[PDB]
A paper describes a structure:
pmcThe specific interaction of proteins with the nucleosome is central to the regulation of chromatin function and dynamics. The tardigrade damage suppressor (Dsup) and vertebrate high-mobility group N (HMGN) proteins bind specifically to nucleosomes via a conserved motif whose structure has not been experimentally determined. Here we used cryo-EM to show that both proteins bind to the nucleosome acidic patch via analogous arginine anchors with one molecule bound to each face of the nucleosome. In addition, to study nucleosome structure in the context of active chromatin, we analyzed nucleosomes that were reconstituted with a promoter-containing DNA sequence from a Xenopus borealis somatic 5S rDNA gene.
Unexpectedly, cross-linking of the 147 and 167 bp nucleosomes with either glutaraldehyde or formaldehyde resulted only in cryo-EM structures of unwrapped nucleosomes, which is in contrast to non-cross-linked samples that show both closed and open conformations. Furthermore, the cross-linked nucleosomes exhibit DNA that is flexible starting at SHLs ±5, indicating greater flexibility in the upstream DNA end in cross-linked nucleosomes. We did not detect closed, open I, or open II states in either the 147 bp or 167 bp cross-linked nucleosomes, which suggests that cross-linking affects the inherent dynamics of 5S rDNA nucleosomes. Moreover, the increased flexibility in the upstream DNA end in the cross-linked relative to the non-cross-linked nucleosomes correlates with a configuration of the side chain of H2A R77 that would collide with a fully wrapped DNA turn. In addition, the two H2A R77 residues in the glutaraldehyde cross-linked 167 bp nucleosome adopt different conformations that are consistent with the highly flexible DNA ends. These findings support a relationship between the conformation of H2A R77 and the flexibility of the nearby nucleosomal outer gyre. Importantly, glutaraldehyde causes only a minor increase in the histone Cα root-mean-square deviation (RMSD) values, suggesting that octamer interactions not involving lysines, such as those of histones H2A and H2B with the HMGN motif, are largely unaffected by the cross-linking. Our analysis, which showed that cross-linkers affect the conformations of the nucleosomal 5S rDNA, suggests that caution should be taken when drawing conclusions about DNA dynamics in samples involving cross-linked nucleosomes.
Numbering used by the authors:
A (entry chain E): 43 to 135
B (entry chain C): 15 to 117
C (entry chain D): 36 to 123
D (entry chain F), H (entry chain B): 24 to 101
E (entry chain H): 35 to 123
F (entry chain G): 18 to 110
G (entry chain A): 43 to 134
Write the structure that this text describes.
DNA sequence: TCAGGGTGGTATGGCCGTAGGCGAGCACAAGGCTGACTTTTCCTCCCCTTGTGCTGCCTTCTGGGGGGGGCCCAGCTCCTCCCCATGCCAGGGTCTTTTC
DNA sequence: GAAAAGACCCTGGCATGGGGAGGAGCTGGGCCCCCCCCAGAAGGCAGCACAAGGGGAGGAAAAGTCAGCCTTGTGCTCGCCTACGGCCATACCACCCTGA
């Protein structure tokens, strides 16, 4: 139960596509922006710029969470690894 | 006369001049500032583009795509440090795994 | 938009390899970012010494502060070569 | 409600891109909360820029500016 | 740029007993000379974003709420629109 | 300053704006706004740094009080998150 | 063995002095600047600014290192911890 | 060779200020090489400004700007 | 030593007309993706032991901190002026948009 | 990516205020030395508690399977928003003197 994970890593590191479905992500963008301004409109490139950055922030956060996991002599990443990574990069202490 | 050939350059020293003046960076702008900041960017572009073309030829391809620019930037140590806050769109990540993770 | 000059540089270094329309919309952002960087640093360098002008000394110091290592060394060399060729 | 459109396969795919081999079952809600905070922070700045320019539509550059305002300059969107 | 003469006045209105040491005055000079460049570096590029040439209370308002956290920007903006209103009037 | 009720110098901030090359034209409300915002922020950071001084049984403000007040907050700490306050020490934690 | 360390923690957390000796710090600074430019003078305030920056940077690093030890179920901070903190920070 | 002037007691006091309870035996040598690169960066970004202003005395303002350009602002020295 | 009252002007900006691109909304398949289930293997987590490196303490000896003083190169100021960068206009060369 | 037409400012020429490079004077503060002496560092030893290895158990991810659903590629429409244009209104800059 660790070989499919190793080929999944080798598959999703070689590719550059967007791993979050565009329609639900655009719905999330539109549902968040509403609390700031009602009747707001977006371009296609506004959504595709929010997503293309939200999918690099999360990948970087995961490459730091994995480092915390390896530090703790572990392979299963846990929420406390994310918390440590965020605290140390200063995102939210 | 072409001041971008008087220098030996290919970036427009005239357009860099007008951008330096319009951008409100100083009440005056010298006569060598446009020529210096049209050879810094020309050299930096000629470096990143050469590295990305090499990365594309390593993938058996003939057209640079954002993946190759990201590969070149994140593979070179100097461009890594320069572009350390840059999210290259449609670039992916560097193919790399931990050694504590393999069987 | 620096697309034509990025094309010229690309054709000069790698004359067989081409560039995509979205690998060109990154070079424009790259050049526009590393312009607004050196130009803001040279602006600070002029303001601290209480100057009204920016020249190829405040550009050189901004290059030396921004670019790391051999990048800065070669960029300073290229800038000096271009300015000393324009002046001549 | 739309935060669950970031499905468990999607977060797991992102983690596999980040090189994560094994994923605990609580990582998914943590990543959803994290993404929500990131999006809330960037969209606020983008809409503030849009309101300043008196527009009604959020342009791509209105987001690029909100992203370079956070030290996360984004290349590729003009 | 010394604001030492003015930092001492505003303290005399809030704490009429506490003083500032010369080491803590040289810090508040660095503070005010820091949020001054912070605000008018955001209100500066905002004009260039709009291809505009004038920095006014519309751009200062935008820069303030673009750099100040939460309830701070809700108050910093509040004081200014209570100021420019009196200045023009 | 007298017309706007500001203890911070409106004329001086106007001179700083014009000489600072922010734009080629500074309006008549720009330095009035940006001498009430700085004045308010200074008042905000002095309130807490004087309360800390009252907490250390001292009639004087010191960089220790300033750092203590700035860090033991939520929004001032977020704003001044990459600032070194000389002779400030660190929060006892 | 450790209660004297907790009282030490309290003592050096309640204090704002410079924990590195000023003369050795100055000689180190002037040894570092010699590589860049020889015959380079220094102010007293310039060196004090460097020492105020460095002693806050190191203290801030030793807080991330302690977190990287509490993560690994340890109390002894180690170079492994320092490298983890300095890599997650972005310095490494 | 004045890097040994950052003595083990000093590195331990700096550690106790951060909250460290127990210190390994390689922490001192590993902190010396961290402070060395930190100073090597700042005392280069300050001498750059010094040389530009055609001065030979490094000023607290050169240091403060060299620190500001690395994301670490310092309040107190001008 | 610098900000404020008064004059003139002109350029930047405010307001209405407009037309067209793009952004939102609606069906419609229908296959790829997702969600639920089951088995089971591997990973996490706890417990035990030890032996080793870390701490605490004691003594000695050093070298950094606190002054005092000399001096001597360096940074700041003042006045000259000259050489560099700017405001403005003519014309076309180059950069911008479309088509294959 | 190359060919073809257009339109927008690039470059040259002319007149000009001004910005900074230079010489001189000055003073100040940074380096260098001298003395003391006492607190701090360095070394050594006892002892102790903590990190790391070993082992075992169980439970929770992971892999394979199957059924449902819903994103999306497509087509179509409506309209509103926004960039451009035209006209003109007044806000602030350059300048002249003064008083805080």
């Amino acid at each position: 139960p660790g070989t499919v994970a190793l080929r999944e890593i080798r598959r999703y590191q070689k590719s550059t596509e967007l791993l979050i479905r565009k329609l639900p992500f655009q719905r999330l963008v539109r549902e968040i922006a509403q609390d700031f301004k009602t009747d707001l409109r977006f371009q296609s490139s506004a959504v595709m710029a929010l997503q293309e950055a939200s999918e690099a922030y999360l990948v970087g956060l995961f490459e730091d969470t994995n480092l915390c996991a390896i530090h703790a002599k572990r392979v299963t990443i846990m929420p406390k690894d994310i918390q440590l990574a965020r605290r140390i990069r200063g995102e939210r202490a | 006369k072409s001041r971008s050939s008087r220098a030996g350059l290919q970036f427009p020293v005239g357009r860099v001049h007008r951008l330096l003046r319009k951008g409100n960076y100083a009440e005056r702008v010298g006569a060598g500032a446009p020529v210096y900041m049209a050879a810094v960017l020309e050299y930096l572009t000629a470096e990143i583009l050469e590295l990305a073309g090499n990365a594309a030829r390593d993938n058996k391809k003939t057209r640079i795509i954002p993946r190759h620019l990201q590969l070149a930037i994140r593979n070179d140590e100097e461009l890594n440090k320069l572009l350390g806050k840059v999210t290259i769109a449609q670039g992916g990540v560097l193919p790399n795994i931990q050694a504590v993770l393999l069987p | 938009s620096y697309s034509v000059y990025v094309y010229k540089v690309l054709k000069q270094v790698h004359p067989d390899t081409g560039i995509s329309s979205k690998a060109m919309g990154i070079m424009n952002s790259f050049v526009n970012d590393i312009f607004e960087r050196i130009a803001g640093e040279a602006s600070r360098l002029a303001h601290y010494n209480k100057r009204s002008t920016i020249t190829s000394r405040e550009i050189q110091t901004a290059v030396r502060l921004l670019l790391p290592g051999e990048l800065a060394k070669h960029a300073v060399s290229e800038g000096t070569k271009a300015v000393t060729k324009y002046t001549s | 409600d739309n935060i669950q459109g970031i499905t468990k396969p999607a977060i797991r795919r992102l983690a596999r891109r980040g090189g994560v081999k094994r994923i605990s079952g609580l990582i998914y809600e943590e990543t959803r909360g994290v993404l929500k905070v990131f999006l809330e922070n960037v969209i606020r700045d983008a809409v503030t820029y849009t309101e300043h320019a008196k527009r009604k539509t959020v342009t791509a550059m209105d987001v690029v500016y909100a992203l370079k305002r956070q030290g996360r300059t984004l290349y590729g969107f003009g």
